[PDB]
UniProtKB/Swiss-Prot annotation:
The lineage of its organism: Eukaryota, Metazoa, Chordata, Craniata, Vertebrata. The gene is CRK. It comes from Gallus gallus (Chicken). This is Adapter molecule crk. Residues 17-78 form the SH3 domain. It is found in: Cytoplasm; Cell membrane. May mediate attachment-induced MAPK8 activation, membrane ruffling and cell motility in a Rac-dependent manner. Involved in phagocytosis of apoptotic cells and cell motility. Involved in cell branching and adhesion. May regulate the EFNA5-EPHA3 signaling.
């Protein structure tokens, strides 16, 4: 399946696909205390490795972990 929501209403999942690296283009600087969110900036990268929930997933960015829509990541080739 192409890396798109394969009609499952599931944004860029990966792990199954990569996990792909993904260049974040809009993330906050949170922490794992914060909902478990990804501390990174626009232009940084986040690696989506955790396929969970029924829609959005958890990335792991060189030691940040958390969950966040694809609506602000570009991806890379794993």
């Amino acid at each position: 399946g192409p890396y798109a929501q394969p009609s499952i209403n599931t944004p860029l999942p990966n792990l199954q696909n990569g996990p792909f690296y993904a260049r974040v283009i809009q993330k906050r600087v949170p922490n794992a205390y914060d909902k478990t969110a990804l501390a990174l900036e626009v232009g940084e990268l986040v690696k989506v490795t955790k396929i969970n929930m029924s829609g959005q997933w958890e990335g792991e960015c060189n030691g940040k972990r958390g969950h966040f829509p694809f609506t602000h990541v570009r991806l890379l080739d794993q």
